[PDB]
Amino acid sequence: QEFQIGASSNQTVKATIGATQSSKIGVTRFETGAQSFTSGVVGLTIKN
Amino acid sequence: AIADSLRSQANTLGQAISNGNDALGILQTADKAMDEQLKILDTIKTKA
Amino acid sequence: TTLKGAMAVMDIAETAITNLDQIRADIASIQNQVTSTINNITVTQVNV
């Protein structure tokens, strides 16, 4: 949404207020692996 | 010619001031409204 | 009745002001020329 604040034609500020319903704000990410029956030294690596 | 251009620019800026004030009004409304959502989320976390 | 339409009507009005100034300048030019003619004629008639 624009708000003309200039002497000439297309000066403006822009507002892009996001959505804030309760179906769109708090969306976490869960994960869980299988039951590990094996041992050994492990090194994780989270990518990106 | 120069005086008419300057008068046009002064009137345009005078109206742009009102556009900016309306933008401030809208944004302040939204901002001060977000506060109750913040407090409600805090209460939800406390109840959980 | 629409945002971009408003920002276009702004330019169209600016161009209109420019054109009317350009025409009024021609009226003024002819008027000054006529005034000078009238002064010179008023003197020449007395001398004649």
UniProtKB/Swiss-Prot annotation, chain C:
Induction: Translation is inhibited by translational regulator CsrA (at protein level). It comes from the Bacteria. Heteromer of FlaA and FlaB. Interacts with FliW. Interacts with FliS. This is Flagellin A. Disruption phenotype: In a double flaA-flaB deletion, cells grow faster and are non-motile, flagellar filaments are non-existent. Belongs to the bacterial flagellin family. Interacts with FliS via its C-terminal domain (residues 537-576), interacts with FliW via its N-terminal domain (residues 1-44). May form a 3-way complex of flagellin, FliS and FliW simultaneously, in which FliS and FliW do not directly interact. It is found in: Secreted; Bacterial flagellum. Flagellin is the subunit protein which polymerizes to form the filaments of bacterial flagella.
